[PDB]
Amino acid sequence: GSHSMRYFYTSVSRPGRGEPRFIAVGYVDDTQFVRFDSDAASQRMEPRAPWIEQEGPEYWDQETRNVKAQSQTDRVDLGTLRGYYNQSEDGSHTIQIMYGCDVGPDGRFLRGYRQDAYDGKDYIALNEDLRSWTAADMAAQITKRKWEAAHAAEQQRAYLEGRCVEWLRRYLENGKETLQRTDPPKTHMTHHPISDHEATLRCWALGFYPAEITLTWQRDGEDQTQDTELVETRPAGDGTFQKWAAVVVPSGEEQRYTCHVQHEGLPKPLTLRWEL
């Protein structure tokens, strides 16, 4: 199916304590493949997936230069934005950047994206056409005019429609044994009485990849949200993901309920019931 490549950067100012903390991570779909951490000893972009380790010295040198340059730009930007907002030098502030590209199952470009935040709020974003920006507030209108003068959208679009998709295609081929394999969920169900009249049914999905999944409880074949609890999809720590969905049911009526599981690794959705 479809695939994505995304980079996430976070810069945090540290008032009265020198340089900000800068962390960069890169992903192909839900798999991290590179990192840079300003607090780490190497001061290099480092590998985080086996299939990127084959890239040569020139690749690691250029990636390191890219992320170091972005960290320097962010450190200046933290001070510039503090000025646009008339904030004091006392507080810690954060800049976040996300960018990346999506390709279809045939490897062709689908969409590109670049968005930035300041203190957890939207600051500026590249529009869908990759030719203009949307500023979230008046401070961001100053940045928008600078970026128009710098032809920043042309640079972003050239990267997103070019190098981004070409390198994503190379990574998908080099790491195909893991990146292009789906791991369907392994499902099970538990039952826990709560009182002499109700019980919790919990539907589990474990060991799946990619992370996108849908768990839905139905009662008499009708979707139900009342008396349900769905936890956020979480990482197992081994490259796979987990999720559960629970419903509180009257004891004696468990057979009215079914858990429906949808995932890319399943050609047909699963339907689980408490007893056979």
Binding site: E63, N66, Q70, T73, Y123, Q155, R163, W167
Partner: peptide, 9 residues
């Protein structure tokens, strides 16, 4: 492959 272009805000 990360982006190589940056310009001040």
């Amino acid at each position: 492959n990360s982006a190589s272009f940056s310009t001040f805000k």
